[PDB]
Amino acid sequence: RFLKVKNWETDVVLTDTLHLKSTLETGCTEHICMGSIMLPTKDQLFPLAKEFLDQYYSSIKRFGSKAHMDRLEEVNKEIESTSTYQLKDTELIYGAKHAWRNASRCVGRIQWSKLQVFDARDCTTAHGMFNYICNHVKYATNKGNLRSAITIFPQRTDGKHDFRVWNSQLIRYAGYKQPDGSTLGDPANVQFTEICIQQGWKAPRGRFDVLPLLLQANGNDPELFQIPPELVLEVPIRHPKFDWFKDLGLKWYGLPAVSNMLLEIGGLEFSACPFSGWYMGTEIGVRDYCDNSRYNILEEVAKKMDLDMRKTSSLWKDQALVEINIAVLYSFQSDKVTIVDHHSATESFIKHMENEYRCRGGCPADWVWIVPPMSGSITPVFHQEMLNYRLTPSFEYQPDPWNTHVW
Amino acid sequence: RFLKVKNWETDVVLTDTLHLKSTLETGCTEHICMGSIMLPVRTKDQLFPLAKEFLDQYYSSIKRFGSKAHMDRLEEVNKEIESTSTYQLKDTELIYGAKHAWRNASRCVGRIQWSKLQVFDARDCTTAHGMFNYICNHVKYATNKGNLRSAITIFPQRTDGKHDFRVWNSQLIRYAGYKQPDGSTLGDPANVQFTEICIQQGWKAPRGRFDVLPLLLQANGNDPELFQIPPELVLEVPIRHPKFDWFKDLGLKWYGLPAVSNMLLEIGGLEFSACPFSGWYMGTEIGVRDYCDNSRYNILEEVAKKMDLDMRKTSSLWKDQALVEINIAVLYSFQSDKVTIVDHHSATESFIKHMENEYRCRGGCPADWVWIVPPMSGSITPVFHQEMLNYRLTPSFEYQPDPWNTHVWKG
Numbered sequence: 110r111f112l113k114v115k116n117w118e119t120d121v122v123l124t125d126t127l128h129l130k131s132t133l134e135t136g137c138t139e140h141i142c143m144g145s146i147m148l149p150t151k152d153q154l155f156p157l158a159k160e161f162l163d164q165y166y167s168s169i170k171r172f173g174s175k176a177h178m179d180r181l182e183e184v185n186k187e188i189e190s191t192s193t194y195q196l197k198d199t200e201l202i203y204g205a206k207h208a209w210r211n212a213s214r215c216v217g218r219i220q221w222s223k224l225q226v227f228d229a230r231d232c233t234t235a236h237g238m239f240n241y242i243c244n245h246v247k248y249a250t251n252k253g254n255l256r257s258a259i260t261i262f263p264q265r266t267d268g269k270h271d272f273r274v275w276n277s278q279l280i281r282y283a284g285y286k287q288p289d290g291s292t293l294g295d296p297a298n299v300q301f302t303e304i305c306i307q308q309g310w311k312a313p314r315g316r317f318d319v320l321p322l323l324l325q326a327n328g329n330d331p332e333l334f335q336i337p338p339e340l341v342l343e344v345p346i347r348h349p350k351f352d353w354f355k356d357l358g359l360k361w362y363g364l365p366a367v368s369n370m371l372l373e374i375g376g377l378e379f380s381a382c383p384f385s386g387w388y389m390g391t392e393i394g395v396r397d398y399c400d401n402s403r404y405n406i407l408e409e410v411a412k413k414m415d416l417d418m419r420k421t422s423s424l425w426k427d428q429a430l431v432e433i434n435i436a437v438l439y440s441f442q443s444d445k446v447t448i449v450d451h452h453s454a455t456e457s458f459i460k461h462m463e464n465e466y467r468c469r470g471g472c473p474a475d476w477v478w479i480v481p482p483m484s485g486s487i488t489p490v491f492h493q494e495m496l497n498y499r500l501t502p503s504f505e506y507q508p509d510p511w512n513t514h515v516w
Numbered sequence: 517r518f519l520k521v522k523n524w525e526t527d528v529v530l531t532d533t534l535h536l537k538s539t540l541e542t543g544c545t546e547h548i549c550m551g552s553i554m555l556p557v558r559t560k561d562q563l564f565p566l567a568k569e570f571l572d573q574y575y576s577s578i579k580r581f582g583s584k585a586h587m588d589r590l591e592e593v594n595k596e597i598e599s600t601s602t603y604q605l606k607d608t609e610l611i612y613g614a615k616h617a618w619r620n621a622s623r624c625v626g627r628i629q630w631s632k633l634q635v636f637d638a639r640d641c642t643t644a645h646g647m648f649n650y651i652c653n654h655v656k657y658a659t660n661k662g663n664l665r666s667a668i669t670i671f672p673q674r675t676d677g678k679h680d681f682r683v684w685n686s687q688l689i690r691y692a693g694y695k696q697p698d699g700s701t702l703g704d705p706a707n708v709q710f711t712e713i714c715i716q717q718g719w720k721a722p723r724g725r726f727d728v729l730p731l732l733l734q735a736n737g738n739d740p741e742l743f744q745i746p747p748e749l750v751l752e753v754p755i756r757h758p759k760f761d762w763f764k765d766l767g768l769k770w771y772g773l774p775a776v777s778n779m780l781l782e783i784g785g786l787e788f789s790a791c792p793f794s795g796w797y798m799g800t801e802i803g804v805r806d807y808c809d810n811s812r813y814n815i816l817e818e819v820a821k822k823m824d825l826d827m828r829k830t831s832s833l834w835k836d837q838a839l840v841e842i843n844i845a846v847l848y849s850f851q852s853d854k855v856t857i858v859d860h861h862s863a864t865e866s867f868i869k870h871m872e873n874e875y876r877c878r879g880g881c882p883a884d885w886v887w888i889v890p891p892m893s894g895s896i897t898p899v900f901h902q903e904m905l906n907y908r909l910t911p912s913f914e915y916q917p918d919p920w921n922t923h924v925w926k927g
């Protein structure tokens with residue numbers, strides 16, 4: 110019931126008690142750990158509401174107060190008659206920040222409390238959704254000095270009138286499969302691209318074509334909009350030593366913005382709730398560029414560096430990997446766009462973990478996702494034991510809309 | 517209940533039925549995953565189920581299940597337990613046992629090799645001098661002049677837990693660490709505690725950076741005793757770099773034989789508290805962990821200095837840059853001296869092939885992702901992208917408290 114976590118590099122030991130408030134289930138049992146699986150009513154709703162308001166009022170040191178009880182009273186009256194309820198602005202802001210505080214896979218949470226929340230609960234059409242999105246984009250980008258943000262569309266009601274952004278990120282490159290057999294652009298988005306096309310996009314069939322938003326308001330069929338090109342800040346990728354690197358033709362976008370998740374606050378589900386912060390270098394250099402089923406550029410880069418590609422034991426992949434990643438960080442920094450390296454970012458998260466241990470009594474964390482996908486054991490998080498559990502409010506995954514949407 | 521795992525790079529889906537035979541706990545619940553936590557005298561009562569269980573598997577594997585030979589063996593072990601309270605394994609069962617414990621070891625990336633394991637039965641051993649002699653033969657046979665061979669040596673099982681055989685070293689071969697009065701450490705910081713024990717026990721420490729430690733051996737519950745492995749039996753490799761000539765001048769070497777001496781082998785309820793096993797190194801255990809952990813030799817600084825990297829800001833990735841070089845140097849040194857070693861690309865690829873095979877033949881392969889994924893270049897190895905189920909099968913290797921915490925001193 111009172112669990113310990115040890116850092117094997119510093120012997121610091123922390124006691125986790127927050128896990129005792131674990132609301133949701135893990136996937137794991139005593140018989141089987143699922144630690145590495147990517148994805149494992151009026152009655153229901155009032156307890157969720159109560160648990161949330163309870164934390165809310167606790168956080169502002171008004172727990173058990175007249176104002177606390179009146180709010181419970183009030184939400185309760187509202188569910189009873191209306192079968193749902195609405196969050197006070199303040200509660201919505203606290204909900205969103207805590208959804209982020211609680212994301213056990215996010216290395217960037219030392220930042221959790223400076224989230225800028227944009228309430229779009231008055232939005233009613235896709236055209237409004239488009240407008241709210243562009244403002245989020247522009248506000249967050251901030252000419253390269255990026256700032257965290259979330260934009261929250263109306264909550265689910267009867268599930269026939271959902272708001273959804275069909276893109277998985279606000280900004281992503283398209284993907285086109287050739288007769289030639291291979292793939293042009295991002296193989297991650299091949300399917301979504303086809304939906305853009307079957308829904309009418311005029312794709313320019315290039316390697317780095319920013320996708321159009323496919324927006325769905327109030328259960329309606331989704332509609333297409335291009336993001337003002339001038340709002341999509343991009344970085345050309347150069348190397349500070351290899352002059353030939355620029356010839357590889359590589360750019361990435363500055364603004365990482367997840368748009369397919371579902372935000373759950375005290376029982377309510379915001380199914381369109383795009384959020385954004387800023388990149389840790391490896392996300393692009395290691396994952397986007399080098400994943401075999403992504404841009405997969407390792408072999409091309411290794412060749413330019415003239416490494417012995419005959420045998421895996423030369424570590425040519427490893428050499429190239431490092432250079433690619435130096436070139437990402439370098440390019441963002443030169444163009445003055447916010448980026449964090451995996452050393453600095455994992456070290457922040459260790460400071461953050463202790464804070465949270467000390468102030469909250471814990472910090473749910475998923476080691477499989479927090480350890481960077483290169484140089485693992487030389488970042489501190491590698492030596493850090495982590496307990497993973499599910500707290501609410503939370504961001505959750507949800508099925509891709511082309512499987513659910515009744516046309 | 518079927519369970520599916522997915523590879524996110526290739527889209528292969530596998531189906532695990534094996535986890536259905538899992539008995540031991542994991543440390544997780546529906547409300548907590550302890551997947552990144554390093555760590556989680558037996559009655560008649562418990563013992564027969566565990567024996568029966570094991571012997572049904574043994575007999576299945578040899579296609580003799582339900583044979584007269586199967587029945588009689590149950591019969592025999594049965595009587596033996598309630599009369600002597602324990603029992604003795606046949607040779608073939610001990611072998612099968614040892615093999616399966618490796619096969620079941622979810623944190624071992626080397627398991628494609630599980631069926632080629634040389635088992636040495638030291639169950640007739642009775643003294644520490646006998647243990648030393650057994651261990652020497654193991655080192656020499658496994659080393660095989662650099663052409664390394666997997667092996668394990670099995671000392672007698674626990675009885676009342678007052679008579680245990682233990683190897684006090686955590687590995688048969690490892691380097692001394694010496695904390696200095698100024699606060700620094702000479703040699704391997706990981707072994708400072710054990711080193712002090714050895715000194716206290718009578719070892720004259722040379723006090724250099726790469727001093728092979730004396731074996732410290734306990735037989736039959738007795739206080740343990742110091743022996744030096746004959747240096748001629750200890751294969752070592754000097755570390756140099758194919759292109760950097762200043763690399764040799766760092767003074768690095770490592771030993772060739774990775775040999776775990778501190779674990780507990782459980783087979784049909786029997787506990788073998790001394791059971792050193794050895795394979796061959798994946799390059800990263802040395803290049804990444806031993807050399808580059810901050811809590812170990814911690815050489816990144818000095819290596820990056822010599823490559824004259826920009827060390828003023830971590831976003832140079834000078835750490836990552838030195839790290840590749842060191843690992844290249846290790847793989848190159850070993851290969852050049854014809855001492856067996858495997859790089860992490862090659863090791864993880866073989867492991868994926870093993871794991872698929874296991875699903876097809878055995879209906880599963882328990883695997884610990886946190887441990888299987890290498891500690892550099894995680895995502896450019898195919899294991900990163902592999903979903904794994906982790907669960908505990910017997911026979912298995914278990915952890916056990918360090919013997920100096922538990923041993924009753926005789927005097």
Ligand code: HEM
Pocket residue numbers: 209212214215216217218220224257258259384385386387388389392449454478504
């Ligand atoms: C401030 C800079 C931020 C950094 C450096 C950062 C870093 C990361 C990283 C590296 C991951 C793993 C994602 C991957 O490998 O695809 C991640 C996941 C995540 N982050 Fe962040 N993050 C930041 C901001 C935010 C914000 C503003 C939110 C929400 C308001 C958020 C919520 C999450 C969630 C929910 C995940 C898990 C996503 C999933 O399961 O696919 N993060 N973060």
Ligand code: HEM
Pocket residue numbers: 614618621623624625626627629633666667668793794795796797798801858863887913
């Ligand atoms: C044949 C060559 C082998 C290779 C390349 C290999 C590779 C590895 C590696 C890299 C680890 C993680 C090491 C660490 O980080 O401490 C490991 C762990 C392990 N291996 Fe092997 N292994 C081999 C042979 C064996 C053998 C012969 C056995 C037993 C018969 C074995 C049983 C284990 C066990 C039980 C662990 C887990 C150790 C722990 O929990 O501390 N391996 N193996």
Ligand SMILES: Fc1cccc(CCCNCc2ccnc(-n3ccnc3)n2)c1
Pocket residue numbers: 147215217278365366367385386387
């Ligand atoms: F194919 C998949 C199915 C489900 C999850 C997956 C991994 C999530 C990848 N997206 C996470 C992501 C992407 C960009 N940016 C962020 N981000 C930005 C700030 N914090 C997180 N996060 C792949």
Ligand SMILES: Fc1cccc(CCCNCc2ccnc(-n3ccnc3)n2)c1
Pocket residue numbers: 554624626687774775776793794795796
């Ligand atoms: F400080 C610690 C406490 C508990 C475990 C730890 C790491 C396990 C290190 N031993 C694993 C190891 C070492 C050498 N060789 C092998 N090996 C050989 C074959 N299979 C594994 N394994 C550190």
Ligand SMILES: C[C@H](O)[C@H](O)[C@H]1CNc2nc(N)[nH]c(=O)c2N1
Pocket residue numbers: 144145146147477478479524900901902903904
């Ligand atoms: C199978 C495994 O769960 C999967 O590859 C995970 C591993 N760790 C990860 N870690 C991060 N940060 N992001 C990811 O997408 C993944 N993928």
Ligand SMILES: C[C@H](O)[C@H](O)[C@H]1CNc2nc(N)[nH]c(=O)c2N1
Pocket residue numbers: 117491492493494495552553554886887888
């Ligand atoms: C806390 C964490 O579990 C610990 O650092 C683990 C992580 N993965 C590992 N993986 C291997 N192979 N060996 C290790 O010692 C560790 N250490």
Ligand SMILES: [Zn+2]
Pocket residue numbers: 137138141142143144544548549550551
């Ligand atoms: Zn688990």
